[PDB]
Design a protein around this ligand. Structure first.
Ligand code: PT1
Ligand code: PT1
Lengths: 270, 270
């Protein structure tokens, strides 16, 4: 059984407000991609629009203005790099694929932009379909309750896979993500239940993709801030791999790679 | 489902027994004990004789000269702390129990000293019986092979539990440890198989105790040295808890506690 593919998060978020222009943010992104690769990332995932807590929506033009220089610079300086883009906007995905990205990660599962499925279908790229409790990726993180969150998410992902296939994406280019954290509920129990039952989602026939990545459900009893959730991220990501994850999305490539290697080894027979 | 109990390692083997100082400074050990407690250790485990790579045997007299001052200082400045002692020697355990230790951790599983079982039986302390491929804790770490390491270790622990009980120790005071790292084999695959099948040991009726703690089986494909094994230790300890460990022994108390809390949460039913 194979190693997990580590997806290193590269957020392009211009919020410094100083004398330097867009080039400073682009240069920051390139140094960060080099570091992620140094730490053993298999894939560099570029995102121009945060969907974390308290985030809001940007225009497609602003999102392209952020990620296009970055993709260009990484492709030229690091041509071996495997590039993914985190976007739910068809116009953003189309340009990113033309510039050499090979993976599109859609937190809306193709629901925010009905044209995105066709953009990926006409390419050679893979698509990540993630479960979210609402169609809008920037909905507030309410305390959503579930009678059976595993069944709810499973039925959702089955439906979205069938829609992606009807739009022309073959099953072997579809990757599935249960969602975690606020995407599921501000109540952490449901994220833990998806992690406990993650192997069930292998019956949909698709590779699995997870992003524990210091999310709110890892706050624990101490209600840890983001900066203190690295131990919890390592544990959650290792257990996800133990239960079938093929991709792990993370800010902390070195540590999460090494932790998930242990999970992979525990999964091996003699 | 209860939290794991975190056993914080306080090893007071001196830097260089023969070349430098004969003992550690007692106040520095107390400082470390206070940090382990403040990081969330439930138990402080004092040991005067190390058993990792290349360790040296020491006499019972010298072992007492190491741990007695440190136990006395901790019981005076931290009387609420739970004390365990890591020793395979009956005369060390006897004095440790007199001074208030409530758990004896024996890496020989009661084999190295025929009197140890009886000393523990005449106390109210718990005893940890760990599997090792050889009785002598300082045996070199050979590449021991197994046809079925789970079966071998299971039958060993069943036999040591029966021996402890024959010596008057009740089953509800017996704690079992599969061993990890060189205690099992210099081949890491056998330590991963024990972790993968740890739930098989719940048939024995005893709480389970594990010490991933930056051991050699966490070296991975990079053949990481001790300093780089914290992520793997978090992942292995978390997975051990997910698979039924009741105690986790570590010197990285803060991080391993937080990671293991995630494993406990994933184990909880809706
Ligand atoms: N495929 C996939 N899977 C994710 O889990 C994901 N998460 C984020 C970032 N969004 C969040 C959402 C919630 C939280 C919190 O509750 O803390 C944090 C970050 C962005 N892209 C993502 N893509
Ligand atoms: N109950 C229990 N369980 C242990 O696992 C343990 N380990 C050590 C320390 N000994 C070792 C042995 C092997 C290795 C390596 O291969 O790296 C490292 C340290 C000391 N007390 C212990 N007690």
């Amino acid at each position: 059984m194979a190693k997990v593919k580590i997806v290193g998060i590269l957020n392009v978020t211009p919020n410094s407000f100083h004398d330097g222009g867009r080039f400073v943010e682009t240069d920051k992104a390139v140094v960060r991609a080099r570091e992620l690769l140094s730490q053993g990332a298999d894939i560099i995932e570029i995102g121009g629009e945060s969907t974390g807590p308290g985030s809001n929506t940007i225009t497609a033009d602003e999102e392209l203005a952020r990620i296009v220089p970055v993709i260009r610079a990484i492709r030229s300086s690091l041509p071996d790099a495997n590039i993914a883009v985190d976007t739910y906007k068809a116009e953003v995905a189309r340009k990113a694929l033309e510039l050499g990205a090979t993976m599109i990660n859609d937190v809306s599962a193709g629901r925010a932009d009905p044209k995105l499925f066709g953009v990926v279908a006409r390419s050679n790229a893979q698509i990540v379909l993630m479960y979210s409790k609402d169609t809008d990726p920037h909905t507030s993180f309410d305390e959503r309750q579930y009678v059976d969150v595993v069944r709810t998410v499973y039925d959702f992902l089955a439906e979205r896979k069938k829609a992606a296939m009807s739009a022309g994406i073959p099953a072997d280019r579809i990757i599935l993500d249960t969602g975690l954290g606020g995407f599921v509920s501000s109540d952490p129990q449901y994220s833990f239940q998806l992690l406990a039952h993650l192997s069930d989602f292998q019956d949909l026939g698709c590779k699995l993709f997870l992003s524990p990545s210091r999310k709110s459900f890892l706050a624990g009893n101490e209600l840890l801030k983001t900066a203190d959730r690295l131990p919890g991220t390592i544990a959650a990501s290792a257990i996800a791999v133990l239960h079938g994850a093929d991709y792990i999305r993370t800010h902390d490539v070195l540590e999460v790679r090494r932790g998930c290697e242990i999970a992979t080894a525990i999964n091996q027979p003699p």
